[PDB]
Design a protein around this ligand. Structure first.
Ligand code: G3D
Ligand code: MG
Length: 175
């Protein structure tokens, strides 16, 4: 994964948001990419955002799951986003409906109009993980097909499995 972002994009404009419930595995993925200097920001208290930047590829990572006063500021980070990576704990069935509701509250925002969506069915390396097609039905991702390029990619963050495919896919669909 060392540098793979660089040889893939080579400083095209690419502003990625990577979100999901806590425990889904985002920070693991962020660090696997070896993207460069992480900058852990607190735009306001109760809102921990971690941003990395390489050439022209920007990442911004935070956990969903509450604290409404910081949502007008979520929308500030939405503006100009070129791709949303939404990470899901595939092995946590009783939290899938939570994760579903938070995904739809983000992806249908007007500031994310037509935004590309990769749903990472992460922790597929745990017994009992839901399959991508299962997650598609549970999440009713068909409702987003009219206006969002989307894919569900099975990943194993701690291995890096699926992460190269994820970046290649985003790249193939971008300017
Ligand atoms: N089986 C499996 N486990 C994963 C995977 N990705 C992350 N885990 C683990 O799940 C926990 C959540 O990781 P983290 O990146 O902090 O989630 P978050 O940033 O979305 O809150 C981590 O363990 P710890 O917090 O204990 O260090 C992490 O090592 C995966 O792909 N497969
Ligand atoms: Mg984290």
């Amino acid at each position: 994964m060392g540098g793979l972002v660089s040889k893939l994009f080579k400083n095209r404009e690419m502003r990625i948001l990577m979100l999901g419930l806590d425990n889904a595995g985002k920070t693991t993925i962020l660090y696997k990419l070896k993207l460069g200097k992480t900058s852990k920001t607190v735009p306001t208290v109760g809102f921990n955002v971690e941003t990395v930047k390489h050439k022209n590829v920007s990442f911004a990572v935070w956990d969903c799951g509450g604290q409404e006063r910081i949502r007008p500021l979520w929308r500030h980070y939405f503006t100009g986003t070129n791709a949303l990576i939404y990470v899901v704990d595939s092995s946590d069935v009783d939290r899938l409906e939570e994760s579903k509701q938070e995904l739809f509250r983000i992806v249908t925002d007007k500031e994310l109009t037509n935004c590309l969506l990769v749903v990472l069915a992460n922790k597929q390396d745990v017994d009992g993980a839901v399959k991508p097609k299962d997650l598609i039905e549970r999440f009713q991702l068909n409702k987003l097909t009219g206006e969002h390029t989307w894919s569900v990619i099975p990943t194993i963050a701690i291995d890096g499995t699926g992460l190269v495919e994820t970046l290649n896919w985003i790249s193939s669909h971008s300017k």
